Structure 1
Amino acid sequence: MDKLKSLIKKEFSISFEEFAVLTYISENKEKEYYLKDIINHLNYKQPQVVKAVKILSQEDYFDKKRNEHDQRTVLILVNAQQRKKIESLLSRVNKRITEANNEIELLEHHHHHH
């Protein structure tokens, strides 16, 4: 249902796909991540995941740098405050997805005949 993705894009200042990257990070709870591994877990292509990581890093969700032993590959870093920020977002987004499903159900229940 695209209306729910539009609601998340509008209200959370991040896309549903950007939210799925944070869900991936929130399930794994590692200190650092590879962008090729984000692509391996979420099949959006290289420029889409780089745009997602550029938006999310500017929104403070993770730190972003080229690797310490190789100057092309990336390290996406997650501090303890960022882990709490991500878990709090997942709680808020699941609650708001529940509210969005409930108002949809109330709009459908208006068809009370037949």
Structure 2
Amino acid sequence: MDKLKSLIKKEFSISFEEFAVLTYISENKEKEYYLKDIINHLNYKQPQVVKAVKILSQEDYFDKKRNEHDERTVLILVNAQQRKKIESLLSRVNKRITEANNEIELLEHHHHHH
């Protein structure tokens, strides 16, 4: 695994694909979303986005439901407590990404090996 991906996964119990799902959700801030539309926008593949959504639903970040007119389509819903939890997570991950870069820059500013 990548070092920053491993650092985020160890700290938050969720991988960078889940952070990308939550980032897209925050960039499109609403009470409701379509899983089909999230799959179309994200760079990750359909089953990767499904696994990230599955993990985030199991971790209670949002609620999954079937569409009532055509059950092939799936929605994702965000309650007021979930909205605050998503902003809190995204800010803490951004803080850890920043601090990880600050440690890398400090290690490169420090003396190198012979």
TM-score (norm 1): 0.90
| Change over 3 Å in CA distance of 1:113–1:60 after alignment to 2 | closer
Provide the secondary structure at the position in 1 that maps to 2:113: coil
Report deviation, 1:112.
6.3
Is 1-10 or 30-39 further displaced after alignment? 1-10
Identity of counterpart residues, as a percentage? 99
Q: 2: distance between equivalents of 1:65 and 1:113?
A: 55
Q: 1: distance between equivalents of 2:90 and 2:107?
A: 26
Report deviation, 1:111.
2.3
Q: CA RMSD in A?
A: 2.0
Gapped regions of structure 1 (runs ≥ 5): none
Report deviation, 1:8.
0.9
Gapped regions of structure 2 (runs ≥ 5): none
Could you report, residue by residue, the CA deviation over 1:16-59 in whole angstroms, capped at 9, with x for unpaired residues?
Answer: 11101100101111111111211121122221111111100011
Aligned residues: 114
